[model samples]
Target: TCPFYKKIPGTGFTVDAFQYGVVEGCTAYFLTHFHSDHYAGLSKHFTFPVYCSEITGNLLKNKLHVQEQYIHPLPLDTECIVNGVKVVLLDANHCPGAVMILFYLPNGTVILHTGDFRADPSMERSLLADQKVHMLYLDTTYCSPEYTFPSQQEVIRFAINTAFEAVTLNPHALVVCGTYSIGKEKVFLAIADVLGSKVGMSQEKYKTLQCLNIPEINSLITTDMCSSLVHLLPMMQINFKGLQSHLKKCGGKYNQILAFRPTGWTHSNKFTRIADVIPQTKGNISIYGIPYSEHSSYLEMKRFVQWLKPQKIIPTVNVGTWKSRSTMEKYFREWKLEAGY
Candidate 1:
């Protein structure tokens, strides 16, 4: 038999009988997003049904290659009863399929879990106004004062503009930048739209995009599209020696090479290592330091906590470490002003 929390027993907070079995008999499991850390454990232990937003469910089934039988997809901002607890999915602007979860317990305890969220003022305004949160499980990945990030739109513009400028300066050069299969695809599409042409994608990314089926932005092209315009290569291909050699031989003379990564500025150590390896060539190798992050930074986190006015705050996803947890608590203390007694 499964175990569950006595206070919110019907909310489906069950303990696995095979495992620790701390809380038993919980009936449901709710996933906030499609991130690996959040959904990775579900398929292994629990065959029970899982609930998530439609976009996240599609992403899990298609992009992450998970089975669809266990997923229950619901629309964003809609409230539903899972077992006996009420649940609502809010728009989390961290990733394309990201979501924040709100759970209302039988004892009048409302908990909001911001799963790897970032500040998109437009999205935050709606979430803050709609949900009456009592407790918060915050995403404190970059809650430290030192961890500052710019807007997503700004970062996208910087990366795209840099790539365009590099191509404009040298038409024959190949612009190679590192980007994820899904998130980076959007950025590449924006770049392609600005340049008025299709950007090249690796066979792997091409296959990944096909699985996602978001064809509204037809910005991806095969290697054949690299004739006149810029060729946007996936970051993975740049690291694989075999693919790197192939790109060198394919159009080494005519195409200029430029590379970029997501953690362009915030994490300089990794970016520096990436820069060291890239072959030093004549055409400009622009390493544009754009602040594009998936999780919320300190300022955004503070604003979220303030708006929620939660009685207690818990940090889960990125709070396993002492430093991360401390940073988050510091922000919580500061934002406590808005949460009046």
Candidate 2:
């Protein structure tokens, strides 16, 4: 079975349809976000209604071209009955429009799908009032203590400060900050607000940002060709090959290229699949990999289970069943730390 989805027995709802095909017996779908990996198999041919955040619904319609009739807007933090399933959308904090789903099943079984979220106090307080869950769906992407990453704000500041120092010192470098298809607007948003200059994105990305409707950041969007010194390129354009070609196109107009990739993967010494992330550099083409993440570390996950005290935890993505059981054992904590990280 595909690890991307889990079905609540007897109900038509399926959380995330990425790994499953459009006709995979689901009568209703709940999308957490627009991350390609999470929305893999979705298409116009999909014949059922999809419950998601308003911003996510817009992206599903505009970007994925899903029919309006099939797209239903599930507002954040509000509980609503969807096809007999009681559901509420909580801010996932993973990316813009991402959400954690709270399901109140008819059998009195409650489920909390953390849907790619990080440590958030508000979300915790909301769940803690009840303090009960039957099955907990977790985003255990960083389910190892070694993945101790700094706060998202801290990483953003580091990137902004790095960019400022590079621009100040180099004077004529074309700066490019790498980001996913939808997340990390904070990085560019902060860079724009701090420097008093708009961050340029491709036309498509700009349209997606418009859907975000973040006036503070939208007011700072610049056309790519407009002499804007900073740009948040699409994920594909941030790699070494693309960066080299970009520099050649700039020719002598810019002598250096400063870049940064803010993600938890930057903290990993055992893994290095992220190509755009340079981790450490300040040379002619500087690219600093700062650890900025919106997912819980292993310690945080342990505490999360301790706090909620769910009966059974479902690990999303690669970790599964017995493997996840062993991982929990492998990462067993000595004791709980202070609540929110």
Candidate 3:
């Protein structure tokens, strides 16, 4: 009852597999989000029509320079017939424009490709709850039982308060938040909004957010790095060495440094409170690895699986090797039996 897949089985549709380069018989391509890993293979010269959310469509154009004609933006929670099969897009809650694609094949096989989603309670009330999905493609980023962390709201609150304390303690210290291109926008945005501080980033990143059109981030962005107390940098640059050079480059306006590194990997059940999570300090740098994530935790995924009771579950992450995949399969069977599937 399992299959390794490049395209959705029994459909000529490919989802977030562009890096594989025009999968055979993939007449229609679906993009779940704008993340580089998901849309890695798309180019301006791509021939087939790319179906994605409107925001994702805009990012494809603004960031990737994809042509307008090749893009087809689908409305969320609505059904559209694509090449004679029923297709629908649902919000993924993973990142901006991320979606869980629903496909109703001609043979009545229902498939759900959860392209990097955070399993929210709202999904229990969505149209998905009404259908018995024959096959489910799940985001297994945090599928292990030990990876359960706090809710996104609680993590954000802890980060904001911790940052506030850091700022209050050392007024001259510059606060730097590490983030990827799209996800974790809420973490930094909330930090800036609560502290009433300007967000500093490279001009290119600022331009990318403008295209994202989040509206709340508009007044907070400042291209001048020195003018803003809070700085946003890529995840790699949050290291001590990177921050040291960055602080030196800022011309000595700041003395100490406080950084927040937000990601799901930063947390495990070993900690009781979010504040008790990992905190590291070296030299003039202090870093808090916040458990802020857009991906669902292991328990959340299990709950979703139990509620859906899909005929079969296929993991989308950490399946590169058979050994790792086998470990994940054990959890799948455990959950499936608990789900009474």
**lDDT top scorer:** 3
TM-score of 3: 0.94
Q: What clash count does candidate 3 reach?
A: 0
Question: Candidate 2, residue 151: CA error in Å?
Answer: 0.6
Regions of candidate 1 where Cα sits further than 4 Å from its true position: 1-10, 14-26, 42-46, 63-65, 211-215, 219-246, 264-286, 338-341
RMSD per candidate (Å) reads 5.2, 4.2, 2.4
Shift in Å, residue 294, candidate 3: 1.9
Worst 10 residues of 1 by lDDT: 1-10
lDDT of the candidates, in the order given: 0.60, 0.72, 0.84
Per residue, candidate 2 scores C-alpha lDDT tens digits across 174-219 of 7788876787778877776666678877788788888875766547
Displacement of the residue 91 alpha carbon in candidate 2, Å:
0.8
Against the hidden reference, what TM-scores do the models get? Answer: 0.79, 0.87, 0.94
lDDT-superior candidate, 1 or 3: 3
Q: Pull out the clashing pairs in model 2.
A: none
Query: What global local distance difference test value does model 1 have?
Result: 0.60
Better of 2 and 3 by lDDT: 3
Residue-level lDDT tens digits of model 1 in 1-341:
32222123335552112233333454555666555545545443345666777766676666555577877887777778776567777887766666777778888777776766776567656646765677776676666666665666766766677767777877765655566444545566666666667666566666555545466534456555544254555555544452356456665555445655565235553334322323333333434434567777767777666666778776665544677667667667767855663
Better TM-score candidate (1, 2):
2
